[PDB]
Amino acid sequence: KSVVARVAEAYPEDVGKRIVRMDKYERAKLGVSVGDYVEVKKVKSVVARVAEAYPEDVGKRIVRMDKYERAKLGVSVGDYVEVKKV
């Protein structure tokens, strides 16, 4: 029902679009598809739309999240967050 992902910097064209890029393996664990919403959580929570991973990121258990979503959770690049279907 949940996976732990390492926060990584968002691709520039995605900044401000409230998406999180997560690969097919992490989506399979949560039972979500591209375009579904997930809750990302450290202590606080934010909801973002799941988007497909970049090829180089597939298999790395990262979540590409921008500075706005990171600001809401009080996390930095390199921190771990919990991701759940919502």
Side-chain angles (χ1 to χ4, degrees):
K1 173 78 212 104
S2 94
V3 295
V4 170
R6 190 169 44 242
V7 177
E9 187 57 89
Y11 291 89
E13 292 296 316
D14 306 331
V15 174
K17 299 185 173 173
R18 299 185 179 187
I19 63 163
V20 287
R21 294 196 181 274
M22 298 179 55
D23 72 24
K24 56 187 177 181
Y25 301 118
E26 307 311 305
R27 297 195 306 270
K29 288 269 164 243
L30 294 189
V32 297
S33 303
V34 166
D36 290 350
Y37 292 116
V38 290
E39 181 188 43
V40 183
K41 187 166 154 177
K42 183 83 148 189
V43 185
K44 296 160 275 183
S45 277
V46 198
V47 169
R49 192 183 289 267
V50 178
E52 183 61 88
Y54 272 65
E56 245 283 301
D57 296 329
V58 176
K60 288 183 177 176
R61 306 188 185 187
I62 62 170
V63 56
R64 296 276 175 188
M65 204 162 58
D66 71 27
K67 56 172 145 194
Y68 300 108
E69 269 64 83
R70 294 199 304 271
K72 306 269 220 223
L73 297 182
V75 299
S76 306
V77 174
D79 293 358
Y80 293 104
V81 293
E82 198 176 31
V83 188
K84 332 167 81 160
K85 186 175 186 61
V86 75

